[PDB]
Amino acid sequence: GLSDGEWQQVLNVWGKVEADIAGHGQEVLIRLFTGHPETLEKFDKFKHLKTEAEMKASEDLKKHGTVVLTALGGILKKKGHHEAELKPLAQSHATKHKIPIKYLEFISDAIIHVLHSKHPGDFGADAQGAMTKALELFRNDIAAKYKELGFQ
Numbered sequence: 821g822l823s824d825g826e827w828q829q830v831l832n833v834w835g836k837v838e839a840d841i842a843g844h845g846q847e848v849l850i851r852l853f854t855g856h857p858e859t860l861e862k863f864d865k866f867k868h869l870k871t872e873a874e875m876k877a878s879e880d881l882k883k884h885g886t887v888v889l890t891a892l893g894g895i896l897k898k899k900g901h902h903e904a905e906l907k908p909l910a911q912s913h914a915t916k917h918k919i920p921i922k923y924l925e926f927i928s929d930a931i932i933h934v935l936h937s938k939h940p941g942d943f944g945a946d947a948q949g950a951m952t953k954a955l956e957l958f959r960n961d962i963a964a965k966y967k968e969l970g971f972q
């Protein structure tokens with residue numbers, strides 16, 4: 821449950837991401853994969869990436885980063901009214917990709933890390949609070965769908 825002012829902060833922060841969705845998406849995934857190498861194993865199409873240099877050079881990783889952040893941005897712009905947008909992602913990530921909710925926590929924190937890394941001094945405490953709450957809401961609603969599906 822975010823206030824109007826918190827959603828305003830979220831969407832203000834998101835404008836930073838939308839200016840360079842592929843660069844943000846790439847860095848989010850690289851942060852996820854390098855911080856939590858087990859997550860790489862969930863991607864048949866990225867498990868060949870042995871080094872961060874290879875990850876950085878991967879155009880397909882940037883492409884997927886764009887897909888991920890485009891989806892997330894579409895969800896965030898719903899300001900919590902995202903059941904229709906979230907449902908297929910929860911279902912695909914539980915049933916097809918088999919992504920534990922822990923990895924969604926990892927990527928949520930990776931987003932925060934990337935925002936500070938790319939916008940140092942420009943991702944204020946209020947913005948971090950609002951973005952964190954929005955990612956918690958996202959993760960929590962996914963978690964509810966995971967529970968429905970019995971997925972761990």
Ligand code: HEM
Pocket residue numbers: 859860862863864865887888889891892908909912913917919923924927
């Ligand atoms: C912000 C959180 C995430 C968003 C918005 C997101 C979004 C997406 C989207 C839109 C797709 C393609 C459509 C689909 O298959 O449903 C996808 C595919 C996929 N996602 Fe995610 N995802 C997120 C987090 C994760 C995490 C944390 C993992 C694993 C650690 C993961 C693993 C995968 C895999 C393996 C695929 C299939 C990739 C392929 O083979 O093309 N996702 N994701």
